[PDB]
Scaffold this active site. Structure first.
Site, PDB file in Angstrom:
ATOM      1  N   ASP C  42       0.841  -1.189   0.000  1.00 36.97           N
ATOM      2  CA  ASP C  42       0.000   0.000   0.000  1.00 36.97           C
ATOM      3  C   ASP C  42       0.876   1.238   0.000  1.00 36.97           C
ATOM      4  OD1 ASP C  42      -3.167   0.396   0.508  1.00 36.97           O
ATOM      5  OD2 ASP C  42      -2.089   2.086   1.377  1.00 36.97           O
ATOM      6  N   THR C  75      -3.918   6.600  -2.766  1.00 36.06           N
ATOM      7  CA  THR C  75      -2.706   7.395  -2.604  1.00 36.06           C
ATOM      8  C   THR C  75      -1.694   7.094  -3.705  1.00 36.06           C
ATOM      9  OG1 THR C  75      -0.943   8.012  -1.067  1.00 36.06           O
ATOM     10  CG2 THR C  75      -1.664   5.711  -1.003  1.00 36.06           C
ATOM     11  N   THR C  76      -1.527   5.818  -4.062  1.00 30.94           N
ATOM     12  CA  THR C  76      -0.571   5.478  -5.109  1.00 30.94           C
ATOM     13  C   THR C  76      -1.041   6.004  -6.458  1.00 30.94           C
ATOM     14  OG1 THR C  76       0.629   3.674  -6.181  1.00 30.94           O
ATOM     15  CG2 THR C  76      -1.630   3.202  -5.523  1.00 30.94           C
ATOM     16  N   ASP C 361      -8.569  -1.114   4.000  1.00 34.18           N
ATOM     17  CA  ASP C 361      -8.891  -0.511   2.712  1.00 34.18           C
ATOM     18  C   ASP C 361     -10.201  -1.081   2.174  1.00 34.18           C
ATOM     19  OD1 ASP C 361      -9.003   0.078  -0.136  1.00 34.18           O
ATOM     20  OD2 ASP C 361      -7.471  -1.433  -0.509  1.00 34.18           O
TER      21      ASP C 361
HETATM   22  N1  LIG Z   1      -8.618  -6.731  -9.818  1.00 37.78           N
HETATM   23  C1  LIG Z   1      -7.950  -5.734 -10.444  1.00 37.78           C
HETATM   24  N2  LIG Z   1      -7.417  -5.900 -11.669  1.00 37.78           N
HETATM   25  C2  LIG Z   1      -6.751  -4.913 -12.291  1.00 37.78           C
HETATM   26  N3  LIG Z   1      -6.565  -3.697 -11.750  1.00 37.78           N
HETATM   27  C3  LIG Z   1      -7.044  -3.391 -10.527  1.00 37.78           C
HETATM   28  C4  LIG Z   1      -7.778  -4.422  -9.791  1.00 37.78           C
HETATM   29  N4  LIG Z   1      -8.140  -3.879  -8.619  1.00 37.78           N
HETATM   30  C5  LIG Z   1      -7.681  -2.605  -8.596  1.00 37.78           C
HETATM   31  N5  LIG Z   1      -7.026  -2.317  -9.735  1.00 37.78           N
HETATM   32  C6  LIG Z   1      -6.406  -1.006 -10.034  1.00 37.78           C
HETATM   33  O1  LIG Z   1      -5.636  -0.569  -8.915  1.00 37.78           O
HETATM   34  C7  LIG Z   1      -5.967   0.776  -8.577  1.00 37.78           C
HETATM   35  C8  LIG Z   1      -5.887   0.949  -7.068  1.00 37.78           C
HETATM   36  O2  LIG Z   1      -4.644   0.405  -6.644  1.00 37.78           O
HETATM   37  P1  LIG Z   1      -4.272   0.285  -5.087  1.00 37.78           P
HETATM   38  O3  LIG Z   1      -2.791   0.024  -4.975  1.00 37.78           O
HETATM   39  O4  LIG Z   1      -5.258  -0.660  -4.446  1.00 37.78           O
HETATM   40  O5  LIG Z   1      -4.557   1.752  -4.498  1.00 37.78           O
HETATM   41  P2  LIG Z   1      -4.018   2.154  -3.036  1.00 37.78           P
HETATM   42  O6  LIG Z   1      -2.549   1.833  -3.044  1.00 37.78           O
HETATM   43  O7  LIG Z   1      -4.317   3.627  -2.946  1.00 37.78           O
HETATM   44  O8  LIG Z   1      -4.831   1.293  -2.104  1.00 37.78           O
HETATM   45  C9  LIG Z   1      -7.343   1.045  -9.157  1.00 37.78           C
HETATM   46  O9  LIG Z   1      -7.439   2.386  -9.647  1.00 37.78           O
HETATM   47  C10 LIG Z   1      -7.495   0.030 -10.270  1.00 37.78           C
HETATM   48  O10 LIG Z   1      -7.320   0.643 -11.550  1.00 37.78           O
HETATM   49 MG   LIG Z   2      -6.155   1.241  -3.516  1.00 39.55          MG
END
Ligand SMILES: Nc1ncnc2c1ncn2[C@@H]1O[C@H](COP(=O)(O)OP(=O)(O)O)[C@@H](O)[C@H]1O
Ligand SMILES: [Mg+2]
Ligand SMILES: Nc1ncnc2c1ncn2[C@@H]1O[C@H](COP(=O)(O)OP(=O)(O)O)[C@@H](O)[C@H]1O
Ligand SMILES: Nc1ncnc2c1ncn2[C@@H]1O[C@H](COP(=O)(O)OP(=O)(O)O)[C@@H](O)[C@H]1O
Ligand SMILES: Nc1ncnc2c1ncn2[C@@H]1O[C@H](COP(=O)(O)OP(=O)(O)O)[C@@H](O)[C@H]1O
Ligand SMILES: [Mg+2]
Ligand SMILES: [Mg+2]
Ligand SMILES: [Mg+2]
Lengths: 496, 496, 496, 88
Positions: C42, C75-76, C361
């Site tokens: 994360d 955030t990422t 999350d």
């Molecule tokens: N099952 C999935 N398959 C492909 N891409 C995904 C999937 N789930 C989330 N994503 C992508 O990942 C992004 C969020 O990434 P994530 O690292 O979970 O965010 P954070 O680090 O803020 O929690 C979303 O915008 C989406 O485009």
């Molecule tokens: Mg996310």
């Protein structure tokens, strides 16, 4: 910023030559690795034999060469104008104006500058003696001593009028036409019309006839063993002297008795020449040998076997006079053409060279005045007037070219500032006085550094030809433009 | 990353030569270890005598040489286009596209670029005088002073029409066919049709006949001891002058009285040639000697013993005119073929070379226009139009070649950006204005750097030959492609 | 170029956190000088406990903090979007656009981007179980192991529905409301609804009653000598135990038998507490003590003298169960409010923390989906759709803001490129495929990194709440803008 | 201040030749790399064969030569007068 580097080099040369603009031009010292030193103030020399590793600076050599070639005077004005122009050009580049806009503005400003200088210039006839004397004195200014200004100016105008070869209005008063000789000591009062080229060489033989009226003068350029039997060496010597007798006898049949040879001699050669009473001067340079051939009328005969009586010249007189310390053959009576060398007297060698340059520039200026017949007030007056009219043009025009034209006006205004600074007056105060005076409608108020005040130039006899100032502006424009147009220094392949 | 290194070198050269693209191209100074400096702005010179240690850069020498060989104009455009192409190629490899895909996309892009440049080009007849003048001025642009543009354009078109050798439609207006002489000072108004090759050499002998109407002109190239008894040396001299008498006598039997020799002379040689009144010019180069042989009609005779009256040429006139400062034999009346040398007048040496290159490019451009008879709007207008249609093609094509074609369009659009930047205008704003204008359907809106605005090029007389731009695009593509095709630098065994 | 320096620092952080965007996010390793190591993916943790000396980068701390505060997810995405925005901003300043124009362009771009994302988003009701499960799985993705995705998603939706406190539609599903405990080993199948806050401490005394149904639960926070004669020490001890006796007596009259104290204990204290059978847990933090006070209903009593039977809470059960290795008091039956702590099981400590972040999350995303009730396709689909409509807006708009708008579109497309790169697919090919797909009208085609292909996201169960994406774009915009708005680094006076 | 440098060189020469002005002129010695030594007090010789790298000083060679040429006496007076003049 290679452009900034080139501008800095041009600024350095401009400030170096700035101090030598005017009657009180603080002279400069040219020292070389050989240790020879010559003191000069005319900007042409200072731009000629200075070291310049910077090649943007090296272009200013070419600029000065062109200035000297067309005008022969105003090189220091051109370089100082280029310096001020690049000053204001750099000033406009840090503001943000693109260089090409500066170039276009300078081009327009300079077109109107030449036009303005055409309007403001007062005309001169070739018979107003005081005006010609004033032009001659103004050009003479800078190098000659204060004492002999009137004398050398009088001799200049006298020589110009007396040797006035009326070639369809354009008098051919060339630099190599007026008769002076060079010698240490004495004075400048030997700049008289001696109708013939005088050589700085002694007679080879004492009993050589020093005086020869209506002498049959000749001009030459050519330089004047296996032994088996005991007397074979004497036989070769006999036949060389026999053929020598033959050639000098067929010379004598033509009647030649005075010779100036381009090459050396030998003791026996001069001995047998003086046996019949033949003058022979050696190591005569190419230019001065050609001058002597033109003056005496004896064509140069490389193949002397074809010399004929028709090929010989004549001179009214040849005489050896012990004037001063050195001994010379004062040749006088070359009646064909007015031909001479730029060799002039003074006290010490620095003063000799200084007076040589001064007389050269003097004849150049009076020649230009007679030719063009337009004189402009000097002493910074022309520069201030053209600057004022350029500012009027700036008020007429609009845009970012107005800034460039104002820059050109300030750069042109820089010249009177320098001329005042070398005079000892404060530059800003006297320059403001000049601007205020020119705003009253009069046009001839300038700076006179002899008197060290601001006064009417026309009444003070401080007037320069129009053409010299025109070319000063033109050359400064062409220098500033072509130094601005460069971008970067790159290594160019050397031609193998 | 040796590919990145080669790209960096190509970018360095591209940015170096970028600044010299257009009418307002800021010139460049070529300095070498010998200290000689030549100010040039035509990119051919700047690519010719610059030092390049990098071999990837050294290929651009060959690219420029090929460009000059086929087209003769557009080396700066080609190098800038190659630089922009490698710009966007470096981007595309940064993204991740493999180089071979970029090469494929560029090849397809330039195929359609040549096609669309064929369609967009407006045709020209060889009789529309205003259009030919506009083409000549556009190519003439860059290097000549603003004052003499109309003049030199007029003389260019006048020479092209008057010397129009109708060789089955394709007029043989070669660079070595139009008559100009080189001399310092004066002006460009001496670029007149003087029917003969004029040599910049003085007569050897004064009494040599300066005027010879219907002279029997010859062309030559050949260069014009043991002693026992006292008179053996004299006998040797006698027989040398006897055989000299013999060969020049059988020459005179042919009737030759005007000669231009490839090699040197001697004082006695010129004396005895002028005894009969024979002209002799020495140290004539191979090229100009061949030109004189073609013009005068006298075939070059190495073995002069076989010279016959049939071998002699004829000239209407030969005359020595003291034009300007230098003395030259103004040969005029060579009636066989139009032959001459690229030697042109101006004020100073830098300006002399500048106008020489300018006039050469001018004749090259009008020759190309007359030959092909297709002109494209210049000022970057053609570049923008081709980029727009390439973007249409990109909209047609789907895949990762679309990115490469868009890269080609951007690199092609870089040329108008450079042309605006050198003009002083802001690049992005005027580029967007050009794109918006071309989106309205009109095709001739470009950039005019003389007026410093955006305007229709056809009414402004800013038009280039289509072939020049075609070859520019092709050479730029072959440079970018075969610079991209390299991987790594390795040391190669030197040929022993 | 300090703005370039700040852009480079933001670039470095963007590229550092780029690799952890998606299901297949390559985890990052945080090592400190103390040597402690935590493996996380994360981006929140990665931006929290990384060292940054660069101040411009130190702003991204605040950006990430704001993102976590408002949205709790993305955030990422925000940091990568900021990185791509500054990518295109740096290239646009390379071309020549002034920064303020880029800021204005980005502002307009993001207003329209928020509008576009509002239109494209598909709505969701709070009763479509499959859609909520898909949202929970998409958010939970990234960190949880591939085996237990279905399980933990099922528990997430089960807890959300069962603990659905219908507070006027907006369900108060807080992070500290759902009941999980942390323990090494075992599995994630202990994330069940245990109605009470469960404290990771053992009972102080063995004979302390482990089972107490309907126990009278209390919550406390207070921490539970001159000698003259031999027995003065004993009298002091007697009166200390007597005052202790009366305070615990008046506690017992209230009836309290279960206590969770904030501070430490003593052996005699716990012994006399267990004499009557009183539970006492020590060193309970401020937050979890407040949570226990809320859950049990016993208000925290700093001054225990006023404790009354009305002040006591009640719990249905308290039990010590030897689950796993560690011994624990499984408190269960706090009937007032749903209150809990974010403590979750896994195999190892790294996986424990990973699962804790992932579950947090997951509740954040499902809470956001229930609240806003608008869900957008994930997997880069929303980015590509918004980019396409932004390019349409660019086609509408004319000027140099169009370049900035296109820059924003490409920076937005950079997210799907990263998501494909971390999935193993080639970025350019799949980006082009996504663009081609979205050009055909469909709007749900994205990238699924589990399947490693491009497919429709809606049928793949890859959907992320719209508000998260809106806040991601907004935070990225503010980050890029206020990093672009800096000029240079200056030393600031430290507050004394 | 190159003018200050030139004035300083002229001052050095003036002070060097100052001491040899008068009936009781303290003589000077001229030593060369060859080792030959000549004792002289007439300032003409002293200005004649002294080593001067400075060119502004090297002009005083020409000044003394002019003095000897026209007058034949008074080189030391001329140089000392030049020194005092450049002082003020
Ligand atoms: N099952 C999935 N398959 C492909 N891409 C995904 C999937 N789930 C989330 N994503 C992508 O990942 C992004 C969020 O990434 P994530 O690292 O979970 O965010 P954070 O680090 O803020 O929690 C979303 O915008 C989406 O485009
Ligand atoms: Mg996310
Ligand atoms: N008598 C004078 N008083 C003041 N200024 C003068 C006088 N004579 C000439 N000048 C100024 O000196 C300028 C020429 O300087 P000069 O050094 O002679 O030029 P150059 O170095 O090219 O020979 C003129 O333009 C004029 O303004
Ligand atoms: N009058 C003009 N105004 C504006 N741009 C011009 C003009 N003439 C030529 N150009 C531009 O300059 C380009 C040619 O530049 P140039 O330096 O002459 O090429 P090269 O260096 O290869 O000879 C043309 O393609 C055209 O775009
Ligand atoms: N008998 C004397 N008493 C005092 N001073 C003298 C006497 N003779 C000469 N001087 C001074 O010495 C000066 C000349 O000095 P001297 O060194 O002889 O000159 P130089 O070195 O050029 O020959 C004179 O100007 C004079 O003032
Ligand atoms: Mg002068
Ligand atoms: Mg060209
Ligand atoms: Mg004395």
């Amino acid at each position: 910023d290679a452009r900034k580097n080139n501008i800095a080099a041009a600024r350095a040369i401009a400030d170096m030559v700035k101090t030598t603009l005017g009657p009180r031009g603080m002279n400069k010292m040219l020292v070389n690795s050989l240790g020879d030193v010559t003191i000069t103030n005319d900007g042409a020399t200072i731009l000629e034999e200075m070291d310049i590793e910077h090649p943007a600076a090296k272009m200013l050599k070419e600029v000065a060469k062109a200035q000297e070639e067309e005008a022969g005077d105003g090189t220091t004005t051109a370089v100082v104008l280029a310096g001020a122009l690049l000053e204001e050009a750099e000033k406009l580049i840090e503001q943000g104006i693109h260089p090409t806009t500066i170039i276009k503005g300078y081009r327009k400003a300079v077109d109107k500058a030449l036009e303005v200088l055409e309007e403001v210039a007062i005309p001169v006839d070739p018979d107003d003696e005081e005006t010609l004397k004033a032009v001659a004195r103004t050009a003479m200014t800078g190098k000659a001593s204060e004492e002999n200004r009137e004398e050398i100016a009088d001799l200049v105008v006298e020589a110009v009028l007396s040797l006035a070869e009326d070639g369809g209005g354009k008098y051919r008063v060339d630099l190599d036409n007026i008769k002076i000789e060079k010698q240490t000591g004495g004075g400048a009062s030997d700049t008289e019309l001696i109708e013939g080229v005088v050589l700085d060489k002694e007679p080879v033989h004492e009993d050589m006839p020093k005086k020869l009226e209506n002498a049959k003068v000749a001009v030459l350029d050519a330089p004047i063993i296996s032994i088996s039997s005991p007397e074979q060496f004497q036989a070769f010597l006999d036949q060389e002297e026999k053929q020598l007798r033959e050639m000098v006898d067929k010379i004598v049949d033509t009647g030649a008795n005075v010779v100036f040879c381009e090459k050396g001699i030998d003791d026996q050669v001069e001995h047998m020449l003086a046996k019949k009473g033949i003058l022979a001067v050696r190591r005569v340079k190419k230019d001065d040998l050609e001058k002597i051939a033109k003056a005496t009328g004896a064509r140069v005969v490389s193949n002397i076997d074809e010399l004929t009586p028709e090929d010989l010249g004549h001179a009214g007189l040849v005489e050896q006079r012990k004037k001063g310390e050195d001994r010379m053959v004062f040749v006088s009576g070359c009646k064909n053409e007015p031909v001479a060398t730029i060799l002039i007297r003074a006290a010490t060698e620095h003063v000799v060279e200084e007076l040589e340059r001064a007389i050269d520039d003097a004849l150049n200026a009076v020649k230009a005045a007679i030719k063009d017949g337009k004189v402009v007030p000097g002493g910074g007056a022309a520069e201030v007037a053209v600057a004022r009219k350029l500012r009027e043009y700036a008020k007429s025009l609009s845009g970012k070219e107005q800034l460039a034209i104002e820059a050109f006006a300030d750069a042109l205004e820089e010249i009177p500032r320098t001329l005042a600074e070398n005079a000892g007056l404060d530059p800003i105060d006297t320059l403001v006085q000049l601007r205020a005076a020119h705003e009253e409608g009069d046009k001839n108020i300038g700076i006179d550094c002899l008197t060290g005040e601001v006064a009417d130039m026309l009444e003070a006899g401080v007037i320069d030809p129009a053409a010299v100032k025109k070319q000063a502006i033109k050359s400064a424009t062409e220098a500033a433009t072509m130094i601005l147009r460069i971008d970067d220094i790159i290594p160019a392949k050397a031609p193998t």
